[PDB]
Design a protein around this ligand. Structure first.
Ligand SMILES: [K+]
Ligand SMILES: [K+]
Ligand SMILES: [K+]
Ligand SMILES: [K+]
Ligand SMILES: [K+]
Ligand SMILES: [K+]
Ligand SMILES: [Mg+2]
Ligand SMILES: [Mg+2]
Ligand SMILES: [Mg+2]
Ligand SMILES: [Mg+2]
Ligand SMILES: [Mg+2]
Ligand SMILES: [Mg+2]
Ligand SMILES: [Mg+2]
Ligand SMILES: [Mg+2]
Ligand SMILES: [Mg+2]
Ligand SMILES: [Mg+2]
Ligand SMILES: [Mg+2]
Ligand SMILES: [Mg+2]
Ligand SMILES: [Mg+2]
Ligand SMILES: [Mg+2]
Lengths: 230, 146, 260, 186
RNA sequence: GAAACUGCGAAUGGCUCAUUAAAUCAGUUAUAGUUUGUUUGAUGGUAUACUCGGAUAACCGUAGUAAUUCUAGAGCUAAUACGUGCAACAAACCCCGACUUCUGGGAGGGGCGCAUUUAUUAGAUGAUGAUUCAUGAUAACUCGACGGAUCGCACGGCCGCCGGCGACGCAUCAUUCAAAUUUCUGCCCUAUCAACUUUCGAUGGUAGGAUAGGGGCCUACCAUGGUGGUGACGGGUGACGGAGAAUUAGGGUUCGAUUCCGGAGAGGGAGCCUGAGAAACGGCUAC
């Protein structure tokens, strides 16, 4: 049985193939989100602790959390949920697909595993490097949290810190910087002010029409009283 | 006397337990019996204004409105609770022979307690909302056979 | 059907559009708007079939997307916008203004109006009743809601609306003796004065109208539109002056024109 | 599913009507709420035609009740269902439906009566207004004898399966006498 | 600017005529018995702010499976996605009510946006042929998906504050686009079809439930009704209805699957999700 081991801290992924029956047994009968101790499933894995995050069977059917068995079942699934991506399918469409239970059994092709606690040794290609984050924060508050700014601190200066610089195929220099979202600009303040002024003018127009109608009705009643005075 | 059901029977939106009762107020106010003119030149029978019956399907004291067709006819059956069969008699022209044939239509109509009717009376019914599976009309005026 | 229809078959189009039978499988289905679909003249028809400014559907789109056409003072870019009776169609580039009136044959005719006369429309009051907050409000047959109307204005009245200011500047009470134009039925486009109003409880109300030359016709209340206080209409009328002609007199006119 | 169509019925002549169309969604019915009197309040959102909302009460224990002669409305706990005119099954199951007769807590109405009239069933202005109100004050002694037990007979006027609420009025007068006779005959 | 998220559409159109004989459908009504994305018009006040939070796609790279817009795990990052949250301020009105000198005054406290539900009350002698109508007031009620944390262009006026033209979005009413239900009258042959319907809804009544809304539509109880030689009920149709078509001195006879209107179906049944709108089938679930 293959193990697709991922190290979320360094962002490295590596597939490990374990065929010995004992090491496989130290994972059998376990469920998704349950954690395993690496010392059980080999020599190189001492200290390491692995979290079972799912897997696929010999027919490529994913394991689902909460099914509570080792076999295959058919479930009516919703789009965007695990075991049913539903790409190109209509909104509100359900489908009955074959999913495997959350319990690890001998009928699994692969176990998706995650490293939660780093062991005493180092795994080649897994914990011996660090793949950097592809993109930096884009929302202003996230930028402030990242660089520990406070109120009245400008976030743009720090956007220039993690610009991606590369050469075009022609050979010219190109720099990429994200557009900051949720950033307060004078246009935003003007928009809020215009909203407030719209409320102002709504109220003023309402009062004006109400007062004019009241004056017209009062004049009409006075004219009726003039008729009565005949 | 009118409380013949397993439930109290009241005119909707009329407060009977009012403390400031008064008789000079309009119908439905101060605990007064509610009644209405159906319109279309039809007088409200005095036994509906002075009645004690509670009929939600009454045209004069109930909640139904008269709108649509106004059909005359003869009482053909009066053996149901507040519902009678109105038979309409008419001549159907036959084009090829240039003659007529007699044809009839049986129209179920709800009759309120303000009218007492017998088979053979000339009745005037007005169209209302569906009151049951087959009833879409309310008796508005009853003319005895004699 | 499981929902609204999006297409108008050309045969099923209103006959006053004068669409030809072999021009295609379809007619422009009027969009929802101020006027009913069966009683309007869509903008695409006005621009292409009537004014000849555009020659195709796509050319109508090109003209309208340039923001060249205002309906009752407001720019419309929808080609199937349901322009209707008394609407002002203005093109503030060629400096031309049009009032959508009916000719005596029941067909909408673009009537040229002055710049000052294009500053108001005539609307027919549909109902007067209390809105929220107890505020009185008026609504018309061309889809407008006007709050705080004059209390002397009742249903079936004609109000004069200034398009620039969006207020009732004057109104006409629906009375016997007021000049009217028929907007529906076989007498569409006929202009006369009301002689009497025959009311019948529970059914439609009949209006008796007599035109200037003395011909008498009758039509329902929902098809009568007051256009002036007395015998003088508030708007200008097309060449026919609302006086319907019998086919014999039309042939007389054609013979006289050919002879000249 | 549950339908509301006249298709499946016999004709008024008794003749059977052959079906000419499958069931449409615009003529559906849904299963009854069967609102129970219980202190485990559950009201569910029912998405209905037009994208509108219907509130489906499953369990209710509190309602908004009006004392019409006093023109006062108070939120009171529902204690028991005592009379139903359509089915005593709904009485034993404690089902809350429109026009059901229920026991409601009289404590809020006692409190309001004490505050407003000064009568249990500190200023010159307050005492003057209280004496003005107490002049002409008349209770009906039936509402009083049930106030003695702290339970008022009430009629559910709202539809719990539609609006998610169990609202009503306090029974008075001839309706009160009618329903007391029914409950004593039970 | 690809991709992708978000939004909208895919309920139209096209095809067919199997079922269906007062049923569809036609003309003619009605909604005072309802829903209605959108358009058009009007309306919107009492609930860190110089602007909140956590995810996720595309991307990237570990995969599984014989395989499918079959599918799992890891690393990132957006919003008009999702979720929260100040919501520019106000009068009026209602209730309680310390004190006051008092048939009152009155501090203070509570309620009060819009929507929802119930109840009381006004609506006279604003509206309709007609409404306990529109609508107002009051008491409460609801664990309210409401009351803008959005975007473009221009960017000026006063000394930081104000500021235009738009776009998108929320809610209410009206309008428009419509549907649903519904009134009356009208259909071929057959009596070698004369009685039919009603346990288990048949006809009506009461109270509910359900529905967008009327209604035996369904439930409980009650009554015994309802249709029928003016042909009920049943059977036949190589029967979808109509506009129409052929032939016609007149009268008539026969046809009307097919391009316009209406209906119905997507192998046969049934059931649904999404959605304003489908019992959808170039959507799903089952037999
Ligand atoms: K339909
Ligand atoms: K859609
Ligand atoms: K019809
Ligand atoms: K209903
Ligand atoms: K019933
Ligand atoms: K939609
Ligand atoms: Mg932004
Ligand atoms: Mg279609
Ligand atoms: Mg009202
Ligand atoms: Mg009922
Ligand atoms: Mg057939
Ligand atoms: Mg045909
Ligand atoms: Mg065939
Ligand atoms: Mg064909
Ligand atoms: Mg067709
Ligand atoms: Mg279909
Ligand atoms: Mg086939
Ligand atoms: Mg289907
Ligand atoms: Mg196909
Ligand atoms: Mg299709």
């Amino acid at each position: 049985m293959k193990l697709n081991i991922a190290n979320p801290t360094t962002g490295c992924q590596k597939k490990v193939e374990i065929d010995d029956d004992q090491k496989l047994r130290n994972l059998y009968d376990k469920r998704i989100s349950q954690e395993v101790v690496g010392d059980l499933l080999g020599e190189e894995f001492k200290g390491y602790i692995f979290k079972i995050m799912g897997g696929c069977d010999k027919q490529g059917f994913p394991m689902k959390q909460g099914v509570l068995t080792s076999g295959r079942v058919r479930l009516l699934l919703h789009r965007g949920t695990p075991c049913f991506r539903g790409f190109g399918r209509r909104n509100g469409e359900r489908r009955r697909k074959s999913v495997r239970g959350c319990i690890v059994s001998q009928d699994l092709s692969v176990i998706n595993l995650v490293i939660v606690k780093k062991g005493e040794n180092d795994l080649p290609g897994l914990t011996d490097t660090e793949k950097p984050r592809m993109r930096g924060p884009k929302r202003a508050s996230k930028i402030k949290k990242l660089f520990n700014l406070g109120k009245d601190d400008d976030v743009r200066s720090y956007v220039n810190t993690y610009r991606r610089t590369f050469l075009n195929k022609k050979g010219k220099k190109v720099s990429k910087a994200p557009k900051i979202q949720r950033l307060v600009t004078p246009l935003t303040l003007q928009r809020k002010r215009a909203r407030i002024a719209d409320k102002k003018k709504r109220i003023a127009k309402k009062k004006s029409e109400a007062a004019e109608y009241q004056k017209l009705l009062a004049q009409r009643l006075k004219e009726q009283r003039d008729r009565r005075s005949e | 006397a009118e409380q013949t059901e397993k439930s109290f029977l009241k005119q909707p939106k009329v407060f009977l337990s009012t403390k400031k009762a008064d008789k000079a107020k309009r119908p439905g106010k101060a605990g007064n019996r509610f009644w209405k003119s159906v319109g279309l030149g039809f007088k409200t029978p005095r036994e509906a204004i002075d009645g004690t019956y509670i009929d939600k399907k009454c045209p004069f004291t109930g909640t139904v409105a008269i709108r649509g067709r106004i059909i005359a006819g003869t009482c053909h059956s009066a053996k149901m609770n507040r519902t009678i069969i109105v038979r309409r008699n008419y001549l159907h022209f036959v084009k090829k022979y240039q003659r007529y044939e007699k044809r009839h239509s049986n129209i179920p109509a709800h009759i309120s307690p303000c009218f007492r009717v017998k088979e053979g009376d000339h009745v005037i019914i007005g169209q209302c909302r569906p009151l049951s599976k087959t009833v879409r009309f309310n008796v508005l005026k009853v003319v005895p056979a004699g | 059907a499981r929902g609204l229809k999006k297409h108008l078959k050309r045969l099923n189009a209103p006959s006053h559009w004068m669409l030809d039978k072999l021009g295609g499988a379809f007619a422009p289905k009027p969009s929802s708007g101020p006027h009913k679909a069966r009683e309007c003249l869509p903008l695409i028809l006005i621009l292409r079939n009537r004014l000849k400014y555009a020659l195709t559907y796509r050319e109508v789109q090109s003209i309208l997307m340039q923001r060249h056409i205002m309906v009752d003072g407001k720019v419309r870019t929808d080609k199937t916008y349901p322009a209707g009776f008394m609407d002002i169609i203005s093109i503030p580039k060629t400096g031309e203004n049009y009032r959508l009136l009916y000719d005596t044959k029941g067909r909408f005719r673009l009537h040229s109006v002055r710049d000052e006369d294009a500053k108001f429309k005539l609307c027919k009051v549909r109902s007067v009743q209390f809105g929220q907050k107890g505020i009185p409000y008026l609504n018309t047959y061309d889809g407008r809601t006007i709050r705080y109307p004059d209390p002397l204005i009742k249903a079936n009245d004609t109000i004069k609306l200034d398009l620039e200011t969006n207020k009732i500047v004057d109104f006409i009470k629906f009375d016997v003796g007021n000049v009217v134009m028929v907007t529906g039925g076989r007498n569409t486009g006929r202009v006369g004065v009301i002689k009497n109003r025959e009311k019948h409880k529970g059914t439609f109300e009949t209006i008796h109208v007599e035109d200037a030359q003395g011909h008498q016709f009758a039509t329902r209340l929902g098809n009568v539109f007051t256009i002036g206080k007395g015998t003088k209409p508030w708007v200008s009328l097309p060449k026919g002056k609302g006086i319907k002609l019998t086919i014999i007199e039309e042939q007389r006119k054609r013979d006289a024109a050919a002879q000249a | 599913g549950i339908s509301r169509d006249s298709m499946h019925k016999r004709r008024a002549t008794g003749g059977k009507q052959k079906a000419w169309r499958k069931k449409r969604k615009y003529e559906l019915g849904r299963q009854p709420a069967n609102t129970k009197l219980s202190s485990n309040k559950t009201v569910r959102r029912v998405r209905v035609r037009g994208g509108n909302v219907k509130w489906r009460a499953l369990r209710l224990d509190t309602g908004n009740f009006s004392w019409g002669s006093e023109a006062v409305t108070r939120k009171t706990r529902l204690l028991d269902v005592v009379y139903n005119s359509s089915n005593n099954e709904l009485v034993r199951t404690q089902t809350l439906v429109k026009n059901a007769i229920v026991q409601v807590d009289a404590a809020p109405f006692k409190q309001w009566y004490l505050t407003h009239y000064g009568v249990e069933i500190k200023s010159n202005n307050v005492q003057r207004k209280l004496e003005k109100r107490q002049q002409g004050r008349t209770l009906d002694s039936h509402i009083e004898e049930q106030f003695s037990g702290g339970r008022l007979l009430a009629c559910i006027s709202s539809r719990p399966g539609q609006c998610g609420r169990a609202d009503g009025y306090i029974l008075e007068g001839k309706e009160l006498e009618f329903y007391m006779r029914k409950l004593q005959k039970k």
